[PDB]
Amino acid sequence: VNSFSGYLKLTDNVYIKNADIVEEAKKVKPTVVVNAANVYLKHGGGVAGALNKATNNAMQVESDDYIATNGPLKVGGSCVLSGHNLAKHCLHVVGPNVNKGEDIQLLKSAYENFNQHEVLLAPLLSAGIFGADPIHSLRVCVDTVRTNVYLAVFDKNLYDKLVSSFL
């Protein structure tokens, strides 16, 4: 049993809810929250901007030190950093950004990072300002992630479309 509440069960391991991932993280304090990161860990907008704002910019300070030491992530890659006030850990995962012309086939590689964690609170990778079709992102998630993932969808309209179109 875990603390996640109000989720619709899509599969054996994938759950979904219409929710603000910041508000959900603040309530649950999950072991892992996933950030929709870019390779530079520049948390300017979308899930990343909202998560970083909720940490009072501590996520960005930590991230800048990580990049200064290690250099940029790969598209499809990830790193584990602090979850600050939101979670124990933040898994920063880089999905392809369609608005930068990145290979959508890298979305499966991105979701494979989730398999290193038994339970996660996450957004749909490459959705929102990353430009991918969120229906596609949910299908790749279900077909790739084997660990238990609780998906928070910010938009109510999109949530209802994801549920009502789910195969």
Ligand X SMILES: NC(=O)c1cnccn1
Q: Applying CB under 6 A, does 47 fall inside the site for ligand X?
A: yes
Q: Applying CB under 6 A, does 22 fall inside the site for ligand X?
A: yes
Q: Which is it for strands 78-82 and 32-36: parallel, antiparallel or unpaired?
A: unpaired
Q: Applying CB under 6 A, does 21 fall inside the site for ligand X?
A: yes
Residue nearer to ligand X on the CB measure, 15 or 159: 159
Q: Judge whether 123 and 21 are in contact, CB under 8 Å.
A: yes
Residue nearer to ligand X on the CB measure, 47 or 79: 47
118-137 residues near ligand X, rule: CB under 6 A: 128
Q: Which is it for strands 8-9 and 14-18: parallel, antiparallel or unpaired?
A: antiparallel
Residue nearer to ligand X on the CB measure, 65 or 155: 155
Q: Applying CB under 6 A, does 76 fall inside the site for ligand X?
A: no
Q: Residue 52 and residue 99: Cα distance in Å, rounded?
A: 22
Residue closest to 49 by CA, chosen among 39, 36, 66, 62: 36
Residue nearer to ligand X on the CB measure, 20 or 112: 20
